[PDB]
């Protein structure tokens, strides 16, 4: 009867695990099914008790629950996240511990006359219901436990979270720092800030079972995008920008990346979450103007300014006019000091081509042609003029190649719709193109990237990024 | 570390051509926490340091970083070892006797490129 909402029209006696404990709890070696400040010496359940070596983890879980609730008879300072990691981590890995965690929490919530302890216990049940459900046998007891305590602040949300986690499956990672902070505030609603390439941000509503794709769906509606195909969330952490897997739970992804960053580059690390375009497949500037002016222009502009493309003096003057218009609109006084602004208008490999006044004069003449355009129209014109370049819509990597004596030691690599592009950093010429149809394999380490088509070997700290983009592009092109 | 170390006394020139070869004497205290990658089986055909974990012994010494190549462990040349073989040799010669570990490393040179581009 999980599918139903039950009502009698009046308050029912508080449901406990007393009757459940007669059949499924081990014998006591204060009730074993009721609150106690005494640490457990053996696990509660007969199933868990019948399995030695699971005894120590079950006891360590109870000690961490006692510590979280403040029932442990000391003040030997504990950060909350370490306690929540101890309570839930091994339960996620060994599902036999999941009913044990629920029974230990419900036990500490039964006949608990200590309001602070009881409040903290409900925060644990709230975190727990967002990770995994109780088993088929325990579910009616946990449901009744919550149903008969509907007036508890977090109780209706615990009931909803069990329905949700049964629908989407369990979490892979224990509570995230953000989830724990909300729990400790007795707040069930969470908003995470999401940053965009156009220097803006939005607050996005997230829950325990929110997947990366759900956040993206909400962002596409919020930004009035025609589609988010090829976009994703990214974590800017340490000196990295890492994409998040669309099918992963948002809080699982945050922890997994933070853990990966800790082992690959050695407290909770600060981070930012960005929403950006990842795959540049079928990008037609003007088709989705909101996507072009929020994402596309602002992602393509810094790659252009770095001087990754092959372009002429005349190309740079023309694009600098559009860039000036996109940034300053009608304000013609921003080119007053050429050294303070030229790096925002012209690719760094081309600034030496003419003097400061010559750039200022040529840019102003170009800019003056956009008097009738809006800022959005300038951004779209910028994109339309560069969208057919073979290096448009690319991720770039500067590497030390060790496989081709005919090429310079340091080369520029572009990964995009056309496959892998090898670029001369001085001339910006395309050395070669490795199309996806010719690539037979690739692999990476933390210090290298290798590709087989006819082999490319290079020194890079960004092999994981190269691998991920190649996989993503290949998976998208196939069907 | 040892100042008087000459790589030409241990390797033939073909084995060290274009490498900055140094000897490091690391004092055995705590866990090494030095991760490796590569191997003779891999695309790079050599054993390199993949990570140096915060805990120490490798990090505490300071002379070993990500990208450096492991050429020898306690006098035994490991340039032709698989990753599993290099890992086993490093774990063995750390536990099995001695107050210290002797690592011959090819120090990775400065990167004349931006190794941290973050654009998509
Ligand atoms: Mg001139």
Author numbering:
A (entry chain A): 0 to 9, 1605 to 1623, 1639 to 1875, 1882 to 2068, 2075 to 2100
B (entry chain B): 433 to 552
Q: What wording appears in the published article?
A:
Myo7 is a crucial component of the tripartite complex that maintains the necessary mechanical tension across the cadherin links. The Myo7 tail domain consists of two MyTH4-FERM (MF; myosin tail homology 4; band 4.1, ezrin, radixin, moesin) domains separated by an SH3 domain. Harmonin plays a pivotal role due to its ability to interact with cadherin as well as all other components of the complex. Both Myo7a and Myo7b MF2 domains bind to harmonin-a PDZ3c with similar affinities via a novel mode.
The basis of the harmonin-a PDZ3c/Myo7b MF2 interaction was determined by solving the crystal structures of Myo7b MF2 and of PDZ3c/Myo7b MF2 complex at 2.44 and 1.88 Å resolution, respectively. Binding of PDZ3c to MF2 results in a buried solvent-accessible surface area of 1276 Å2 (484 Å2 from PDZ3 domain and 792 Å2 from Cter). Two aspartates, D546 and D547, are involved in hydrogen bonds with Myo7b R1921 and S2082. The last two phenylalanines of the Cter reach to the centre of the cloverleaf where they interact with all three lobes through extensive hydrophobic and hydrogen bond contacts. In this buried environment, the negatively charged carboxylic group of the Cter interacts specifically with three residues of Myo7b, K1918, Q1914 and W1895. Notably, the canonical class-II PBM binding site in the PDZ3 domain243031 is not involved in binding to Myo7b MF2 and is available for other partners. Thus, Myo7b MF2 recognizes harmonin PDZ3c via a new binding mode.
